[PDB]
Subunit: 168 residues, 12 copies
Amino acid sequence: EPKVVGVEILEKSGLDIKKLVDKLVKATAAEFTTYYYYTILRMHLTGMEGEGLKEIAEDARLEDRLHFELMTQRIYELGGGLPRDIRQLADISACSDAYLPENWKDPKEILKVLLEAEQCAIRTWKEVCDMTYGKDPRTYDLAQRILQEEIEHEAWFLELLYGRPSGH
Amino acid sequence: PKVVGVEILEKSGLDIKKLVDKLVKATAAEFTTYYYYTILRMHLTGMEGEGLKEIAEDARLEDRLHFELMTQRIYELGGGLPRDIRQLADISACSDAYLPENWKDPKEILKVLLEAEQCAIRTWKEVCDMTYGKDPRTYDLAQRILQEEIEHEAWFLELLYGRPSGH
Amino acid sequence: QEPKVVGVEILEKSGLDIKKLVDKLVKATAAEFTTYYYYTILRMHLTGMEGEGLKEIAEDARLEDRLHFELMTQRIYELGGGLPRDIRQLADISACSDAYLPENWKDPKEILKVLLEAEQCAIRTWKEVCDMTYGKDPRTYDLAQRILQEEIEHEAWFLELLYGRPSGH
Amino acid sequence: QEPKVVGVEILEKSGLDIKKLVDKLVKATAAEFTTYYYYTILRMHLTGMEGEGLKEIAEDARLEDRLHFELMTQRIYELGGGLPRDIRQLADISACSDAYLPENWKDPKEILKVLLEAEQCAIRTWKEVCDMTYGKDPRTYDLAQRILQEEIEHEAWFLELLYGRPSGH
Amino acid sequence: QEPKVVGVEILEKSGLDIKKLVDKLVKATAAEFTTYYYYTILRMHLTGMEGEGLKEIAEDARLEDRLHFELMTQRIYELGGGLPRDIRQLADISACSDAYLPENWKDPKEILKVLLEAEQCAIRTWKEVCDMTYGKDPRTYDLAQRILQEEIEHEAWFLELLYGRPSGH
Amino acid sequence: QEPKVVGVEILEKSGLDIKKLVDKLVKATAAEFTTYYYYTILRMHLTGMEGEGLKEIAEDARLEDRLHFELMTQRIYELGGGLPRDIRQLADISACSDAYLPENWKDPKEILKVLLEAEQCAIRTWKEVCDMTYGKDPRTYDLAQRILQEEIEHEAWFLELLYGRPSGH
Amino acid sequence: PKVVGVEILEKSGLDIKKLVDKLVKATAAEFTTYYYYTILRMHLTGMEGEGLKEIAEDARLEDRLHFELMTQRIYELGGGLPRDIRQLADISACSDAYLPENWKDPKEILKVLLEAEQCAIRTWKEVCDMTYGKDPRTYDLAQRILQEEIEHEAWFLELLYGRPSGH
Amino acid sequence: PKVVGVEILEKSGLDIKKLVDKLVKATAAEFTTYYYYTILRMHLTGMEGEGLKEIAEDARLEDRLHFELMTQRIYELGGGLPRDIRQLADISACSDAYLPENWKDPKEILKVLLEAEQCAIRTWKEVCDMTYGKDPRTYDLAQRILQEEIEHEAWFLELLYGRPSGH
Amino acid sequence: EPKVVGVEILEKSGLDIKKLVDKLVKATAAEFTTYYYYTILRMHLTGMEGEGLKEIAEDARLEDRLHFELMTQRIYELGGGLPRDIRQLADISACSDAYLPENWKDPKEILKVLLEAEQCAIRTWKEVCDMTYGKDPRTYDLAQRILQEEIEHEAWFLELLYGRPSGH
Amino acid sequence: QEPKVVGVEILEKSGLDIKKLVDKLVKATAAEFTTYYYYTILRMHLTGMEGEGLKEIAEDARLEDRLHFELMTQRIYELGGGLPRDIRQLADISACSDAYLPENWKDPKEILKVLLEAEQCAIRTWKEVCDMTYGKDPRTYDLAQRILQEEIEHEAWFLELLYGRPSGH
Amino acid sequence: EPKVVGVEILEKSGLDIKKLVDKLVKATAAEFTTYYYYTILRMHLTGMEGEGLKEIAEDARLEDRLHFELMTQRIYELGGGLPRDIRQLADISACSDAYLPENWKDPKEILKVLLEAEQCAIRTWKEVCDMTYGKDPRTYDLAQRILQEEIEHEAWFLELLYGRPSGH
Amino acid sequence: QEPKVVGVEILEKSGLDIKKLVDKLVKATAAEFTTYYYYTILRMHLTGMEGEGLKEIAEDARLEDRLHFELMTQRIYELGGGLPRDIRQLADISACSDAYLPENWKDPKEILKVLLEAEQCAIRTWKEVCDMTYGKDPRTYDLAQRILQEEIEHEAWFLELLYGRPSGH
Ligand SMILES: [Fe+3]
Ligand SMILES: [Fe+3]
Ligand SMILES: [Fe+3]
Ligand SMILES: [Fe+3]
Ligand SMILES: [Fe+3]
Ligand SMILES: [Fe+3]
Ligand SMILES: [Fe+3]
Ligand SMILES: [Fe+3]
Ligand SMILES: [Fe+3]
Ligand SMILES: [Fe+3]
Ligand SMILES: [Fe+3]
Ligand SMILES: [Fe+3]
Ligand SMILES: [Zn+2]
Ligand SMILES: [Zn+2]
Ligand SMILES: [Zn+2]
Ligand SMILES: [Zn+2]
Ligand SMILES: [Zn+2]
Ligand SMILES: [Zn+2]
Ligand SMILES: [Zn+2]
Ligand SMILES: [Zn+2]
Ligand SMILES: [Zn+2]
Ligand SMILES: [Zn+2]
Ligand SMILES: [Zn+2]
Ligand SMILES: [Zn+2]
């Protein structure tokens, strides 16, 4: 088999690459399911109450799809892969399925689901940062970038649900 | 002069005078919509109506382009717009989208917008039915317009009621 | 009681079975979503000097199929339908068989075969939708026709690679 | 092996004669290619102060007809057909009569007559294709309809110049 | 409560009659909206080889006058006025006479005469607004001045076509 | 001795008190700078589902007012004036009262009231500058008029939100 | 022909022949500036003059556009440019901006630039005074130009002396 | 009419009738190339031919622009294109770039492309030699075209053989 | 009150968030005052000596305004705010007021003030980096980005005052 | 010291008379500057419905000739020459006769004649420069050739308008 | 001499700046030689085998030239410089000269050279990251960015030589 | 045996020594590469208030010379030549002397002298290539002429800075 120096420099640090890839896959799986589940959640932000909220949920959805594309590349660079079956992907997702709630006509119910998904993502990508910190500059940078946007996403929904200031 | 773009329609047994008459009435409604939606958008005020303005604005501008689009086709078919602007108002396929009395309730404005769009859907669907399998040019343009009226209705349905649609 | 939806009424007047249409739309649109996932993996494994040029053709199909998902999803909700609540449901009701990475994937022709079969299924799937909406539902027909148009192109791409059959660019 | 082409199968199921369709497509597309050549010459000879403003209208038609050629050529190969081997064959099978420079070309109305007759032939030609593919072949219909749409516009341009007949811009 | 509108107060302090100003603005803005309709028809009928180059000049005026309508309508509502409830009312209160298609429209000079008279009326109309707002209402003056500026250009275009009078481009 | 500044001489010939003008300009421009700061905080606290849509309107005003600061600052130096040496001086000489975050800011109407009052002060402030420069200083008048024009729009935005009063977009 | 854009000015008691005469002389100076600033910019050489070239270049190009701008207006008012280019030079509102003798000192070039701009300020200010409250079109264009001449003077004042201005 | 753009060439002792005749034959080859390269590109199929299509496409589109470019010049010199499109085919400077019999081997297609480009190089080089030192306009355009034919040959040489060239 | 997971992940590290926000506010305050004071400093880079220097001071001014916008967002994400009064902001600024010097007609006097402001900013943002290093990826990244531009700004003015090479 | 200018040395080695070349360049470039002035007037007077479409062709020539002036002026200074101190000197040394507005300018053919004669002079003028720099001065040749190229186009435009002679677009 | 605070903050950390600059110069020298040597290597990726490979080698070449431009700036900011002579630069390069191989007509021979150059770059920039980690935010960020692209470059050539998945 | 290269054959027919040409091209192109390196260092040391404005002129030359390297390198391979195997070879065969940082670099005139001498060498170098290819090799001549054209401009820039000699912008 071939010498992969991009991997060797990580192994020298004592980094467990199988464990890292496994965490990346679960985190990345959650991004893909988010892209699906946030589609439905955005659709159901209806009425005059929910109208302005759609574009905030839309932004999060599209940015999370790009988080999937971003970290997928890295998984393969490290010698890992995505699950063969899409159902496997759903089952190993780092996060709980962001289902449409029962009383979805109250947009706060939708916002709670979005908020919980984002909070899970924050914990998930923060764990990846802690592992790659001081060992894997490439993975750390990508994971830090993603984490940075999840923090923003949580801040958006916190501002809508509660009266908590954040951004724009 | 020989107009072959018309001859190919006549061969299909399409009544062109009747078609143009329908096109003019449908196109006239697009022009009045451009005027009336201006006033309806202006009065979507307050914190309730603020986000609604841009949705009404999008419909208004798209409907003006529907007028531009089908006006070209009317003249290609040998027809024309009414000589007087008041005639145009009178032959409009749709009822006048007047500002309602309790306009400070934005739902009243949304009701008027919704009714205007629903009329447009029925209007352009009729044109599609006549041109279907006979007039590819007019069908395509009418279909395109109808497609956007469906979207417009869906927007206002989502606002008035809690009914999902688009973006 | 429930709102009047005239965009749906004009379809019902034609005798169109809207529940049956929406069902077909959901299954077709579900296949576009799974394509987006499965083509990702298929594209990743078009490796070596043989597979290098093939990646961007598979990429083009993947990205266009994701936009097919976005496009028809909007229409499904306009018709009063919805996507499955669970992502696993979506996978299961898909109109097409799962485009799994083949066993001998290092032969790029094996991957091309899987891509081709997926596209061929999509052609049949969207053609059925066109036949139902033809002369009844202008909006759904136009969107389904547009999608079908690109699936035909996608098939043609992979036919040109697998066999020596001329198509496009 | 001879490959399964599902984009063709779905057409055959409708009872569409594909050999006859491709033959019509080739003759129509040939006329587009000759238009691109002949309209070059016709445009060149729209001279003087009378013909100056007419050049750009003939130019627009020329370039749009060249894109019609490019558009439908792709579709011909997707259907398993091809362009004629020889360029002279193409000229001979053209759906339309050759748009030759008239004898009294210094009268710009003589040139406009030739342009108009060429467009009128194209309208009839692409309308036939629409009638054949209508309800059977969504892809070919859509493309042919798009082209027909522009030929109708082109005829309208020249009708407005020759006679005083309103149209577009 | 009835709100304090300081953008209006600063005008009242100058001794400006706001009801009279708004009335003039509405009549002037109404003429812009009717122009957009009537110039459509006038442009359509600038046919033949004589009228071909004239279409785009009439087009430019039409589109610019539609933007004049949009521009001043905003200002009317800022001043606490509104457009007429009915579109027929708008037509009736228009500052200018209806720009009807003339009888011998096949002579493009007949159309140019109508265009010119409409522009000349607009110049007088917007010049009056400038005189009223001059030294009192900077916002309305600036907008009216901008519009007047383009009406002067429009008149100059048609004067150059009808007569041999130099102007612009 | 000191350079001849003809851009200033033409103003002095009109009898314009340049020291007094520059003073008014500095105080007006100081208010634009503090607006940029204070609107930042006000925008940040337009939270919840009530305040979400209001943020971008407050944002637009903030950014436009910062450009008003940039615009008139250039002019102040052209007239031989300058900004205060200390940033605390600037705050104190501001033409307008500090747009502090209100106590019950969680009611977005409280924030809107503060925004409205700031804009109303700016309208009065720039209108005074227009009155002084009117018929004497074309450059300062034009810039002050432009700014005033946008403050009128800003007021209209917040009037439409607080009360149901129609304006713009 | 009836020219209503002119009639509205005559009603104000504006002397149009006198106005056009001033406009032509002012516009002529803009044309000569375009020529003379070319030569002045070329000779802003050395390490001293290197940064100065682009400031002189900006003025030159803006002044050429002033010529284009007001030339249109002259013809709208029924006037015209001089038949001969030498006439234009002679009726210029400003003295010829000749390359000075000790041009290798860039301050000499800056002095010539500054004097030309100062003349332009006085020239266009006079036009503003005449058209003020009578001719909105000519006033607006003249005001716009004057505005840029003020900026141009400020640029050269900042270079020659230590006087702050802009960017 | 006096055509001075032609007179300046005649003074150089340039045979303009002979030049135009060569230009027409060279330009005719560009037009046929646009047709024939279409078919050649279509048949660069399989995994072997996939990357080759875009290189053949680039040549095809550039050669069509060569036709547009020199066609203008032919008319400036008082010449014209053949009345019949079949005449154009017959007077082409180059042999017809027919699809070869064993086209499924992409090297067969590349051979045809290469031969067509090599003919074009010789064709436009001849035009450069005639116009060299006499006709700056025609020389410049011919030189430009020749420059791209050299590049086209280099592309196909790199594909057929292992010969380095460009990108 | 609401659960803010973007904050919780920082608290787990042992990061003092009140102390961090306090440092961010003082640093961010200095960026805002820079935007004001560099306006005046740029205006007074006059003559043929100062002409080319204006655009370098302009670039720093505009980039520092964006540093204010950037870190302000983050302050609110962390549950902090800007001072209620603008005068408070000036008083808590991390840096000394970049006043116009007395002999400003010598452009070197202006450059000295600009240089001292930038040097203060370097120390200020470096302190923030040291605190957030290995605990707060989002704040660290933003502070590192800003620091990176302050280093460039100092290098610009060092190249003008002294003959010290840097960049472009 | 007097500096070594190698860009000039390489020309002197060819036996090129640089003083004579610069003199020709100045006279040719002077004609471009006067063209920019005179073509302004000529364009203004292409009025009526006859002259309307002709304006933009005269406009294109005017603007392109102004860029010819800018282009070759740079080269004159690179060769160690300069433009005349006085603008009147420039007019007098112009390679071409002054393109004055003709007496019967209301006939647009009279204007076209003047334009044509000016272009024909420019062709002869720049062709001379090409002949001198040919095989000696690559930079001056290339620039002169580029200009000549556009003058040939300009002559072709006016020949097509005056007479019925084909050319371009 | 002048106070350079951008350097002082590094010295406080205990960072050896002479040693760091020396490593930066050798790393940066390798980027410059890469720009030259990859030109030749790309030229010789000929035939129908090598055609698609040219653009991948082109991308690496151009990105490595930008790595040279990027880190050169930083070298001067730290008070270092490039070698006076270009031949010195070649001799101190961190990497072995990426010469055209003897059997270059086999594109795999070229790919091996490209791969070895990229693997050397990975080790080189990873060393810089390890030194600047937790001491020099600016240098670390730039070196991390470069490393990130070298990892991608290695992954490209690994995918071509062997059948190893990576990116696009 | 070896492929027929017609782009080379047409040159050989002219009697052009291609081996000698390629050799000159390589040495000229090598100097463009070393310029890119050496100008980097020279630009870096144009410090202080004296050198600030000079940096961007040196930058422009550096970047343009790197593109000269890219441009002619392509041509060298088209002619069947190649770049030196070792980068040290390239440095040694360079047509120009190494543009080293001078000892008293803190005087920007010392740096300008080095830049000027490098450009002057490039002018002579590319002029020689033009003389050889003149009337034989249109492609190489055109590229070499273009490069020469920019070296003349580069020299003119540095002549204007070092001495007071007018040039361009
Ligand atoms: Fe998220
Ligand atoms: Fe609508
Ligand atoms: Fe597909
Ligand atoms: Fe056509
Ligand atoms: Fe008008
Ligand atoms: Fe404001
Ligand atoms: Fe000026
Ligand atoms: Fe070719
Ligand atoms: Fe800073
Ligand atoms: Fe000319
Ligand atoms: Fe690399
Ligand atoms: Fe150079
Ligand atoms: Zn995410
Ligand atoms: Zn509509
Ligand atoms: Zn699809
Ligand atoms: Zn066509
Ligand atoms: Zn108007
Ligand atoms: Zn403001
Ligand atoms: Zn001026
Ligand atoms: Zn060609
Ligand atoms: Zn900062
Ligand atoms: Zn010219
Ligand atoms: Zn690198
Ligand atoms: Zn060079």
